[PDB]
Design a protein around this ligand. Structure first.
Ligand code: PRP
Ligand code: PRP
Lengths: 466, 466
């Protein structure tokens, strides 16, 4: 069972002895500090609130467990047993904390407050930053959701330019990241963050998380199709790639099927096997059930172009109203190797220059989508901005001399729409002047209860492209 | 409840209809493919076997749950209900799988078999590659352990050169990665992997994982010390940094204490506050209770060197037996900002050139230690190498034309010691010839049971530096 007393950075166990005496309030905030990612999707907090923070999170046994561990960990009894016991006795183990957050799915420019944390009981001044560690981990679903949306922007731009519409955009970037992430829990979190923007996923874990923590009107938030891997092709033996190909497309004749084609020779597979030997099984396919040829090696741009070049000469290629080449509806290509935001841009641009419609191509991304991201990409940061000491509120901040970018905000914070319809974070409690509209930060957690939640449908709506 | 039927890549649900008819055996292996990072620490499989793979992992409820999810996920009844029911009825939900692996903590050159997977029942040919996704996630603890060890190699080289010994090496790289990782589960896995090489950690989750899945003779595998953060300094107010400093060091006067000193001006804090105003509280401290000054901004190397020069002028610096400058034992520095394998090397080399002993410095790493790593850093891959179809064993492999590095191994595999005492992976069942010694892989999993285990003490011993 999870223990919140053991879910913090070790040194935070010693911080209750470090704050100024007579401190009754610690007030902190999360932002993606200003530095290619000018706006961020806020997503993932509701998961953390429900799974880890809500209800009775302190028990008699959990306090003793923590006390025993930290005694050995520090070689000293520094642990605040008395502080945690107070929470157990007075609030039945419910956290006297208030969390206010911008609605999930909201797209917010960098350098704005996204959520705030404060203690609601003066005895628990130390608790605000105790939970920094668990809350800051929201950086990940935020960053995955943001990076995924930015890739959608690129896909949208090129799809619209090369085809004149956005049909099937929500299926142009497929999550292949399950094996390439660091854990089962990460897989589910990351997969769900991608599903804010897209509907194609192989990371099943993401579906259960959305169902449990967010909810959607549809039975499932994400979908997939039958697909081959190298084991299902190579198990037939090198001399029998054609038989493997034939068997798989015949098995999945009435649904879309993706078939990895680079086991031995991708260019041979497209020209000779797909383009000649088994052509008759491809041209007879439905528009609802295309063959999706999947290269999986070589230079991503060069390989996609060569594959399209080969297929264009073996199958009846048309030219759409924008003047771009289009494969027949029963045949498509998915690039699922070496795909990240940079190579995605590189491929669609190379395709456009060679006059190929983005209709022809879909993308798959694993590590690039769910793993090759850090807390530093969006400068995700949690800092104390306000304390009450001796009954007086003081605006607090860091401002390192050698890095002005690390300067933090002062005082009590609020988020507002500007008259031109942008966003502004007001500092030093200036939001109380009512010069702007309503504070966009809403109480989502208070004293052990989740007070406002959003469905996954609402989140998708909020995170739409312009 | 974790459901193994929902813990695979979506397309693997469709693979039982893709293998050649009358396939009785699927045999696959894991390696870190060849072409820094020339050898890998094998760590983390035991965790996966115990948490996810062992015992009764199939129930009737879990089969129905998966059936209903995949029905909506594929918009089709492609899920292998009968295959999974067979396992439940015949084996009481235990996986008919055998896994052979190198001992954990073992240091193996790239391009060698690390573990193999095969089905023990002909009916369950499809199960071998079903569990690929779960098992491939071992890339992460392997990569953390390996990258951590490579950093220890760098630290050892410079500590030995500047001081003449390796005292306290195991405390020179501290885990700060809790908030910087993608999930709670990743935090535990990654922290445990770092603890294979070092003993300092702030990521508490790592302790419980080790004690549950590996075990150590000591009460805890990892330790920490009291330390300040920006909130516990800045809360005092801009004009009261000295008061913050004084309070914290006097509260923790008998243990080591780390104090972040860059809230407003790092060079002012070192020269005027530590070096003048509070010098009397530093020079009185025990050798077992040093002040550890923590810069946290600016250029990592330039800041460390400037901090050291400042302290050198305010404090009684000595010269060690190797001719390098050494701060008094009550005074140390920790650089915990922007630390990864590359910048660690830069700092210790830069220190050496300015004649500063590595005794003076410790490092902390967060994202660089536990997050900024991917599956392709060590080329971690899981591939089928051998199948039995129509009673005949067939050597299986991929060899893509445009990437010869992606070529996989053929047939039944075994790991051996060479006459010169190195490692060799023999292919095509050639290990049966016994021209080398016995196969060095052990059966670690068979038919739902963990059959071989290693304590965390064994692993640490296996993974030590030469
Ligand atoms: O973007 P990524 O994180 O790489 O994930 C996508 C890739 O992962 C799989 O490769 P596989 O597991 O066979 O690894 P390998 O290609 O390195 O052998 C799959 O064949 C995709 O090409
Ligand atoms: O190696 P990393 O992943 O950066 O983690 C380590 C850093 O994290 C903490 O800063 P904080 O959480 O305040 O982040 P910030 O300095 O970017 O605000 C700490 O002060 C370290 O500098």
């Amino acid at each position: 069972e999870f223990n919140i007393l053991l879910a913090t950075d070790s040194y935070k166990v010693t911080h209750y002895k470090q704050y100024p005496p007579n401190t009754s309030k610690v007030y902190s905030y999360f932002e993606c500090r200003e530095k290619k990612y000018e706006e961020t999707v806020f997503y993932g907090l509701q998961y953390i609130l429900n799974k880890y923070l809500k209800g009775k999170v302190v028990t008699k046994e959990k306090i003793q467990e923590a006390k025993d561990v930290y005694k050995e960990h520090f070689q000293d009894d520094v642990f605040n047993e008395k502080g945690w016991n107070y929470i157990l006795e007075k609030y039945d183990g419910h956290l006297p904390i208030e969390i206010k957050a911008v609605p999930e799915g909201f797209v917010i420019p960098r350098g704005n407050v996204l959520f705030t944390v404060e203690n609601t009981d003066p005895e628990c001044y130390w608790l605000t930053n105790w939970i920094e560690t668990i809350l800051v981990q929201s950086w990940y679903p935020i960053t995955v959701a943001t990076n995924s949306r930015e890739q959608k922007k690129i896909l949208a731009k090129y799809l619209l330019e090369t085809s004149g519409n956005l049909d099937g955009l929500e299926y142009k970037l497929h999550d292949f990241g399950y094996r390439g992430v660091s854990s089962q829990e990460t897989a589910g979190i990351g997969a769900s963050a991608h599903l804010v923007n897209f509907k194609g996923t192989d990371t099943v874990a993401g579906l259960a998380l959305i169902k449990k923590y967010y909810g959607t009107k549809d039975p499932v938030p994400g979908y997939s199709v039958p697909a081959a891997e190298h084991s299902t092709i190579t198990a037939w033996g090198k001399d029998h790639e054609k038989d493997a190909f034939e068997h798989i497309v015949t098995q999945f004749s009435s649904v879309p099927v993706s078939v990895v084609s680079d086991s031995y020779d991708i260019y041979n597979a497209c020209e000779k096997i797909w383009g000649e030997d088994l052509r008759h099984l491809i041209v007879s396919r439905s528009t609802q059930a295309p063959l999706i040829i999947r290269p999986d090696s070589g230079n991503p741009l060069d390989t996609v172009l060569k594959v399209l070049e080969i297929l264009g000469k073996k199958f009846p290629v048309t030219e759409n109203s924008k003047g771009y080449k289009l494969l027949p509806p029963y045949l498509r290509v998915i690039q699922g190797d070496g795909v990240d935001i940079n190579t995605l841009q590189e491929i669609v641009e190379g395709m456009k220059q060679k006059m190929w419609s983005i209709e022809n191509i879909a993308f798959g991304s694993g590590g690039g989508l769910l793993q090759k991201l850090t807390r530093d990409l969006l400068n995700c940061s949690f800092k104390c901005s306000y304390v009450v000491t001796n009954g007086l509120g003081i605006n607090v901040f860091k401002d390192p001399v050698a890095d002005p970018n690390k300067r933090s905000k002062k005082g009590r914070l609020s988020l507002h729409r500007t008259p031109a319809g942008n966003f502004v974070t007001l500092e030093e409690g200036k939001g109380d002047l009512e010069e702007y509209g309503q504070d966009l930060l809403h109480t989502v957690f208070k004293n052990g209860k989740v007070t406002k939640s959003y469905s996954f449908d609402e989140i998708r709506k909020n995170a739409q492209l312009n």
